[PDB]
Amino acid sequence: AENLWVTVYYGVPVWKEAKTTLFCASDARAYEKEVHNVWATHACVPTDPSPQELVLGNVTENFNMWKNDMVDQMHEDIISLWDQSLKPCVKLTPLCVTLICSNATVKNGTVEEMKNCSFNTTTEIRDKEKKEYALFYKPDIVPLSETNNTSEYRLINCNTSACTQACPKVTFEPIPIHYCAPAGYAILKCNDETFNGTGPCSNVSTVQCTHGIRPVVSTQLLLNGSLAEKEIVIRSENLTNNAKIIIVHLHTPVEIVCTRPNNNTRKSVRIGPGQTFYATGDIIGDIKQAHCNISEEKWNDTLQKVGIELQKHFPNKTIKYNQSAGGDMEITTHSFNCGGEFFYCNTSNLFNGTYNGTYISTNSSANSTSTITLQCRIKQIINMWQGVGRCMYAPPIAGNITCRSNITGLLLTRDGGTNSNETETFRPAGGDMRDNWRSELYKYKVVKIEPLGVAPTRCKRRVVGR
Amino acid sequence: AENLWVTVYYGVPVWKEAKTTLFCASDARAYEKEVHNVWATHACVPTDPSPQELVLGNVTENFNMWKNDMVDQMHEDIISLWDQSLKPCVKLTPLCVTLICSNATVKNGTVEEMKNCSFNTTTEIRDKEKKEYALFYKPDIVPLSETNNTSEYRLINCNTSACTQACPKVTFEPIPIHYCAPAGYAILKCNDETFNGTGPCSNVSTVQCTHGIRPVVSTQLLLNGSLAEKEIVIRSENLTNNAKIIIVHLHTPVEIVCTRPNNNTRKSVRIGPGQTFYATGDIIGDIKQAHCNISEEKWNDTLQKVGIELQKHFPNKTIKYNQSAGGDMEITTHSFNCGGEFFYCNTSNLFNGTYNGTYISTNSSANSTSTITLQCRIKQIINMWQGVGRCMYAPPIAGNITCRSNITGLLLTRDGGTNSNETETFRPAGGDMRDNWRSELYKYKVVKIEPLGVAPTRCKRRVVGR
Amino acid sequence: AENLWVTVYYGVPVWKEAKTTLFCASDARAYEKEVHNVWATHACVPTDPSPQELVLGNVTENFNMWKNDMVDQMHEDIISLWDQSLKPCVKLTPLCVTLICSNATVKNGTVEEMKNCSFNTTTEIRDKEKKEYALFYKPDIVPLSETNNTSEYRLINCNTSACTQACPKVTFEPIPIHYCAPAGYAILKCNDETFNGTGPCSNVSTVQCTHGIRPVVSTQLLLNGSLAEKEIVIRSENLTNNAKIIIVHLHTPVEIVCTRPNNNTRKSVRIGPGQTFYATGDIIGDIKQAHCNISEEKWNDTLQKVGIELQKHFPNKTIKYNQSAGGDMEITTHSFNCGGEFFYCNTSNLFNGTYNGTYISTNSSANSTSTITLQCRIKQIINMWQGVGRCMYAPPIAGNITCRSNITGLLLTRDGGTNSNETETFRPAGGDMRDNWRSELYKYKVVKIEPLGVAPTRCKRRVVGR
Amino acid sequence: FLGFLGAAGSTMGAASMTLTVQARNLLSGLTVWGIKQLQARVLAVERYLRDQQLLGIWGCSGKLICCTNVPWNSSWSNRNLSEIWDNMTWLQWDKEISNYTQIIYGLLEESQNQQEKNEQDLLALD
Amino acid sequence: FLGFLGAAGSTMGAASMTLTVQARNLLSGLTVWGIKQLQARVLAVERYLRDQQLLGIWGCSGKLICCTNVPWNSSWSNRNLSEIWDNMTWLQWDKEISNYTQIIYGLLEESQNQQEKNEQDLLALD
Amino acid sequence: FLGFLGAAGSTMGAASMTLTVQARNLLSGLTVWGIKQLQARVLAVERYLRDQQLLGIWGCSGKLICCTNVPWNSSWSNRNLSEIWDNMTWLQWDKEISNYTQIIYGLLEESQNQQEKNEQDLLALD
Numbered sequence A, B, C: 001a002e003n004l005w006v007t008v009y010y011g012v013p014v015w016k017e018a019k020t021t022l023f024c025a026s027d028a029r030a031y032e033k034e035v036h037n038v039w040a041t042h043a044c045v046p047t048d049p050s051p052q053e054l055v056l057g058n059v060t061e062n063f064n065m066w067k068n069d070m071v072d073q074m075h076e077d078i079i080s081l082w083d084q085s086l087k088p089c090v091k092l093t094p095l096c097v098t099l100i101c102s103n104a105t106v107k108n109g110t111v112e113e114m115k116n117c118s119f120n121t122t123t124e125i126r127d128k129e130k131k132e133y134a135l136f137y138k139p140d141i142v143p144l145s146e147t148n149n150t151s152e153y154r155l156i157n158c159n160t161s162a163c164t165q166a167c168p169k170v171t172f173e174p175i176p177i178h179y180c181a182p183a184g185y186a187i188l189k190c191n192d193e194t195f196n197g198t199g200p201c202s203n204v205s206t207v208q209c210t211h212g213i214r215p216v217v218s219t220q221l222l223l224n225g226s227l228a229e230k231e232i233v234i235r236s237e238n239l240t241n242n243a244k245i246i247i248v249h250l251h252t253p254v255e256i257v258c259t260r261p262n263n264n265t266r267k268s269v270r271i272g273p274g275q276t277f278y279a280t281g282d283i284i285g286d287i288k289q290a291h292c293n294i295s296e297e298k299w300n301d302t303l304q305k306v307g308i309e310l311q312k313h314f315p316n317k318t319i320k321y322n323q324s325a326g327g328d329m330e331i332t333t334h335s336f337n338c339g340g341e342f343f344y345c346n347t348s349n350l351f352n353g354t355y356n357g358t359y360i361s362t363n364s365s366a367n368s369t370s371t372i373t374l375q376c377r378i379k380q381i382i383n384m385w386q387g388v389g390r391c392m393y394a395p396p397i398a399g400n401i402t403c404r405s406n407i408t409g410l411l412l413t414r415d416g417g418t419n420s421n422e423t424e425t426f427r428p429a430g431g432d433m434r435d436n437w438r439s440e441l442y443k444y445k446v447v448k449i450e451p452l453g454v455a456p457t458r459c460k461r462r463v464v465g466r
Numbered sequence D, E, F: 001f002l003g004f005l006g007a008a009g010s011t012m013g014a015a016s017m018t019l020t021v022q023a024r025n026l027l028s029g030l031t032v033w034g035i036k037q038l039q040a041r042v043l044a045v046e047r048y049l050r051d052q053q054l055l056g057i058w059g060c061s062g063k064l065i066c067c068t069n070v071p072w073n074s075s076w077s078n079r080n081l082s083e084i085w086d087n088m089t090w091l092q093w094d095k096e097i098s099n100y101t102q103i104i105y106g107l108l109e110e111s112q113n114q115q116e117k118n119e120q121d122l123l124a125l126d
């Protein structure tokens, strides 16, 4: 037919899969007042990007949630913002002293897990010490290193690090984060609903920036996420390897109330040149455990439906939910950050004694009914990121602590190498904080555009001046 | 004639008004010796920028001094350089002990306002404390909580913060600063003399950088500025609203001598691993209070002329100058930074007793005579930026403190809304530190060039190959 | 022939000699494990750049090792990496207390260099102090300001500064650095043999980066360098002025073994709360000094040959090598750093007793025999960069300290201004640490490319559309 | 040297002679104050490259005065030719024309230079 | 407006209409997080200038669609012309041709556009 | 590939064949060492853009070897043509012509390419 020649195009639509920095954009409204939030300080940018989603169509490509780097980018960011927010604040180094602790007597009774500690401080004058007292929860306190006297105690941190107080202006709010591609990269969404975390997504869309991610931390139930829009979904890097965590997404959230009832007063204490440190005060009385409430009907149906979805991966056997495996409260309990208090709630009352989720679809209905109720511990001395990042002391909050949230997903594993005869068992377990990001970022990828291209065509030459 | 076609020009002379970073250029000669001056450290670029003023002509546009953002560029910059200058230095935390204070004795007399305080320190060995003494001015000192013994005192700061000593290398010198625009921005001077702070300036010139601004801090008189070269000028955002500060510029300066007479010795005291801290010593004697002298012969005429100029806004009424209204010395006195000591001078002796400025033109003539003399307090513990930034301790200076300055402007307000019958009254006031910048940057703007442009002309086409 | 016209070329091979920032690059393999190596931290890029050398040929230009800015670039980088690597670590502030010290006793012997000191610390609890002890080498210790009891002692630093302990992960490993010039510069090597530090080098090559520099600090013998590949070479800025140091390079290395024999245990002590601090412990016994062995055979030949080379600049006279002049061990001994202990070894046993280097060629052989042996002081409190940078405490190393090195060059001066009859003399002296860099960066330059050029040719015009 | 912006008061037919004088100044240059220099310089370079890319899409790359085939609409402006070029400054004309920026660019990009490039390729087809 | 990458599933003969819409977006823009923004932006500028310089060396500077005098080799690819332009996406073509990148680029440099500019200088000698 | 600077010893008539090889490498790329790398890279990009802007003002933009209509003045240099191109290096020529830098640039900016652009607009006027 005709001779063919190298012709050159710039701005060609093509890309390669590659790692990059991402910009941390925000809803603009926080940084009017919320100076240095513990998550999302004003290091993140008040750009408030409109979600300019564009359907590509006719393109299909391989997403993978497990090998994803945006999760590691978020893990290194959230740690950085936590450390940045604590570094300016008061250090409890001069508070690490001999504490004499007796009982917390309140209004014809005694509080269950708080002790009443007397201790020594300086005034604003280095050579003038004084005595004063503060209430501490038993998990923050330990018997003094030699047991000479059953009333001598110390603050827990002293043999490991000096905890910074979290400044009152530096809040714990879970504000939405939008991650944005720098120039020459695009973010891709997988819009192919019922995609199960890996492989060829059949339906793909571009965006400049992600949906509003919330940097929430809890370790057995997930909180305040995005629902799976079609059906309940199970995700794991290998379901047959029982050590791989099994993230589950709900289609209808369960409403959880987490609460305290005590009435409580806040106290200010100093050992210095000037500073303030906040400490716990005297009480007005009716007495209950701090607790959380879940609807029996809604929960029952929710664990039933997950049993059916797991039976499609594990056929001809009965699936039973059970207690968290063992160890200390830091992994065996549902962690939290409600209202500015770090709750730690037992769940052995909740993942319990359940028969075949498919056969339970027979039951699957009730009238209005009583709450499942979870007993909670609370503590103030925190080693937040599983040992890494600084120790933090959370200052106490006066009076009215309570919050309401949506359960949107669960962090299961299968049980150990049992006989497995007619049966399989599943347990809640918390793992690494990364899974709290994978349970939102699973449907994203970042790609680098490679805008040059060469192709044959019948354009013969750039004949001089033609 | 013919059809007209879109033609395109690049590098077109046009601009839009916009906010930007400015560069802190400087005289190059400072950083050979003066490592980290408190105002323009070597973070300001040694450059000595050439004053390449160019007159535009036939251009006339809206200047405004009150809304000007270069004022805020300077306000944040000067605060930033102050904190960078303090951060390396010795913190007076270990000095906050019980002070026992008795009188200071010299030539068998008692000094006016310096107490002699004995206190305790560690040597360089932690388990070896010692006793020693230093002189402190009464304003740096306060009685300890109750006068169980009346001679117990503390250093003022400790119930609020911890003061860094100013490092001896880091001078307070008010060296000139040149503000310069980055590429694609231009700086415009208003050269239309008697421009009164806002409106269309009928004569404009470009520069790459401002004239050399001295960053001089004083709070009632303004010191060492640029004069108004045509005539005295009165500026305020609204003269009818009495709450708006009235900045005045002088045509001829008044020479002020600010001085001390004491002869004084400097002492070094430690509480440490090694560091040095500087403290005030024993005295050699003939004694008068620290003071400033203003020549009556010049000052009389100056408040007379300004009175005539104010009467062109306040017609058919007599003008009186009166005392600063009320508050602590930190607002009611003329603040300073003379020779490395922080003076605070009374002005109720100066803004006094003065009748109709127009009628005083009938006087306006004298032989030379005595000085108006101002009594001055001094203090070393400083909260410089009206409590913004760190607390600073200024170390004492040996012997020969004296400096000479030019009054170039005043900061006034009108009096309160009394009956004002046939009369009006004015008082000096400090306000916010910004007005020490507006009293130089009044005739400036920054503009962004927009160098693309489109226009019609008879250039028919880019005809192919033509 | 014809008219000639200005024609323009971009990318012409031409350069101007100028100063620049330089990149630090390394072999990739360290920062897999070796976080914050004291020399070449992960601030140096793990590029492992290939030595893509390119001989230019037909070019000749002037080099100068003495004026070379790369030396100053290295000095300001090495100090910055030192200070930044110490700034995170534990400060020996609360250790500065009244030490009470007696003899270090082992298997009925007494260790002459080490004293045994009791002292007091806080436990982790601020109001609970305890007694404990550690061994300190005599140079780190000095008697308390008044000897009330002669056994009262202190750590040496306290009347100057607070020393940081060098953190346990932060190694002194002298890993290779490659310096690389940034874009639009180039690095030129002189590849002419026997280039003597200044003048026109006849044979020049481009490289992107230097050979592997080791940043080794030692102050009378140079260590682990690159040999002069043809002859022994002498370099100085002016040999006739005896004030200029005389750097020598050896053609053949002399192997030095530097060793300790003690067996010694490493002890941990706390005064704080977040921690590791390391202190010196109890001993198992045979007693021998820290020492170094140099082979007489190799050393004699080496100082013989250098005597011939010096005689070619100093004709018809005899040469003798002699002791370092005087001052403290910090200048008069071979400073070292071996395996993490700072040896300071005497050399008056070594630069000795030597006659005419040309006549000693009559000896020039032996059957292999006994070593010259050097005695060594050791110390832990270090002011590394001749008084600049932080004070460092080097934590003790357990058991097996021994290292082996190559002597590759020497730092001489000539002797003082005697009659010099028939004779001249030379002495070891360490000078400024820059000469540990000039003995590698001698054959090097950085040049800036200026790629625009204009030249005449018979190309008549860019005739319109032609 | 006529000076940077030194023609800002001149008629457009005079100011349009100074374009090189001005264009050469669109592009020049223990502490975090170094972030002022870096963040200013990167923004200045970014603005210059946005102008050069924008001229390249219109087909004017490497010219200063450039001519294009888009005809005028009397809605954008309708005054006499000398009442532009012999009569007013670029700074004044900008505040007349400033509505029809974006409109003129969208008309230049596709509806001129993309179509010139479609036709050039179909010519060099031979 | 098809939008950024809005043609990535379309045929090469339809995607090659949108090149301006995409190329206009290859260039855009107590704390160290400013070092993210600077290190991202200076890399995005540096990548863009490496494309522009590479288009200058091949002789295409300021064009998007461009034509050169180098003929095809059947070893690089050899299919019918409609199976290229009328049939497959640029994303699919890129995964077919990717072996012959660096081969074609080194061939365009010396062995075409330097040689054209040698002959141009030998011609303007007259 | 002769390499970067790999012809600096060669005669101007040989070294002028390498220009792409060298030009293609004028553009490349708890801690303050991030500020070093940024402040080197932004300065390297600023120097390259200052050169490309200056080539555009002379009218050469995109060409490496470029012809212009400015005649020689025998005061700047006057050696026979073979004593340049056939005989000596660009580096040795630089240290001869170095006085006439700036003098030749003002002659190229206004006194050629502005005048060419004035006359070009008066041609495309038709």
Ligand SMILES: *[C@@H]1O[C@H](CO)[C@@H](O[C@@H]2O[C@H](CO)[C@@H](O[C@@H]3O[C@H](CO[C@H]4O[C@H](CO)[C@@H](O)[C@H](O)[C@@H]4O)[C@@H](O)[C@H](O[C@H]4O[C@H](CO)[C@@H](O)[C@H](O)[C@@H]4O)[C@@H]3O)[C@H](O)[C@H]2NC(C)=O)[C@H](O)[C@H]1NC(C)=O
Residues within 6 Å of the ligand: A171, A173, A174, A216, A223, A224, A336, A337, A338, A339, A402, A403, A404, A405, A406
């Ligand atoms: C899952 O998501 C839910 C929300 O969807 C979260 O629940 C909310 O949590 C926030 C705190 O993180 C709660 O906010 C606090 O509410 C207090 C009460 O506000 C109401 O009542 C006052 C009058 O008394 C009204 O003025 C006000 O408009 C409300 O009607 C406030 O007193 C608190 O103020 C403090 O914080 C703010 C910042 O939020 C500061 O600006 C203030 O100065 C002050 O320090 C605070 O606003 C909110 O009430 C919760 N809502 C519900 C329904 O529970 C969950 O926390 C989240 N899950 C997890 C794990 O975080």
Ligand SMILES: *[C@@H]1O[C@H](CO)[C@@H](O[C@@H]2O[C@H](CO)[C@@H](O[C@@H]3O[C@H](CO[C@H]4O[C@H](CO)[C@@H](O)[C@H](O)[C@@H]4O)[C@@H](O)[C@H](O[C@H]4O[C@H](CO)[C@@H](O)[C@H](O)[C@@H]4O)[C@@H]3O)[C@H](O)[C@H]2NC(C)=O)[C@H](O)[C@H]1NC(C)=O
Residues within 6 Å of the ligand: B173, B174, B216, B218, B223, B224, B336, B337, B338, B339, B340, B402, B403, B404, B405, B406
């Ligand atoms: C309004 O503007 C005026 C100037 O127009 C300022 O007045 C000057 O203020 C500076 C300090 O701010 C004074 O400088 C000091 O002068 C002392 C005396 O210097 C003379 O005597 C020595 C020999 O004894 C001579 O060598 C010298 O040339 C002078 O003739 C010095 O002892 C001071 O030294 C200290 O500072 C310098 C830096 O300046 C350091 O290098 C030294 O190491 C040392 O620490 C100092 O130089 C100056 O004398 C004042 N001039 C007058 C005429 O008064 C006002 O300060 C300003 N107003 C305000 C509000 O700031």
Ligand SMILES: *[C@@H]1O[C@H](CO)[C@@H](O[C@@H]2O[C@H](CO)[C@@H](O[C@@H]3O[C@H](CO)[C@@H](O)[C@H](O)[C@@H]3O)[C@H](O)[C@H]2NC(C)=O)[C@H](O)[C@H]1NC(C)=O
Residues within 6 Å of the ligand: A323, A346, A347, A348, A349
């Ligand atoms: C989560 O639920 C478990 C299961 O009930 C709680 O732990 C303890 O479990 C044992 C059975 O394995 C319970 O039975 C027995 O109690 C008697 C009490 O005297 C004891 O002597 C036996 O050795 C045995 O433990 C036990 O009652 C139960 N403990 C409690 C307090 O209920 C667990 O408490 C729940 N998790 C949390 C964090 O509370």
Ligand SMILES: *[C@@H]1O[C@H](CO)[C@@H](O[C@@H]2O[C@H](CO)[C@@H](O[C@@H]3O[C@H](CO)[C@@H](O)[C@H](O)[C@@H]3O)[C@H](O)[C@H]2NC(C)=O)[C@H](O)[C@H]1NC(C)=O
Residues within 6 Å of the ligand: B323, B346, B347, B348, B349
């Ligand atoms: C600025 O000037 C005022 C006005 O003189 C000073 O304050 C005090 O003002 C009162 C009048 O309101 C003066 O008169 C009386 O003095 C006698 C003294 O025995 C006293 O009994 C009266 O109660 C009344 O105070 C008073 O003399 C005057 N004080 C002084 C020291 O002059 C003011 O001191 C001046 N400002 C500063 C900062 O010094």
Ligand SMILES: *[C@@H]1O[C@H](CO)[C@@H](O[C@@H]2O[C@H](CO)[C@@H](O[C@@H]3O[C@H](CO)[C@@H](O)[C@H](O)[C@@H]3O)[C@H](O)[C@H]2NC(C)=O)[C@H](O)[C@H]1NC(C)=O
Residues within 6 Å of the ligand: C323, C333, C346, C347, C348, C349
């Ligand atoms: C480097 O070698 C010198 C020279 O030997 C050592 O210093 C001392 O130098 C003197 C001569 O100036 C030596 O001679 C004499 O020794 C007798 C011993 O009874 C004494 O009575 C004399 O007053 C004189 O000192 C002396 O032996 C020598 N000392 C030692 C310990 O060798 C120097 O010690 C060597 N360098 C270092 C750092 O040790």
Ligand SMILES: *[C@@H]1O[C@H](CO)[C@@H](O)[C@H](O)[C@H]1NC(C)=O
Residues within 6 Å of the ligand: D095, D096, D097, D098, D099, D100
């Ligand atoms: C648009 O035109 C009107 C009438 O001339 C004018 O008032 C307005 O300021 C112009 N707006 C812009 C954006 O140029």
Ligand SMILES: *[C@@H]1O[C@H](CO)[C@@H](O)[C@H](O)[C@H]1NC(C)=O
Residues within 6 Å of the ligand: E097, E098, E099, E100
């Ligand atoms: C070259 O072609 C083969 C066959 O299509 C392919 O497997 C290989 O990955 C290609 N390599 C590149 C760099 O395109």
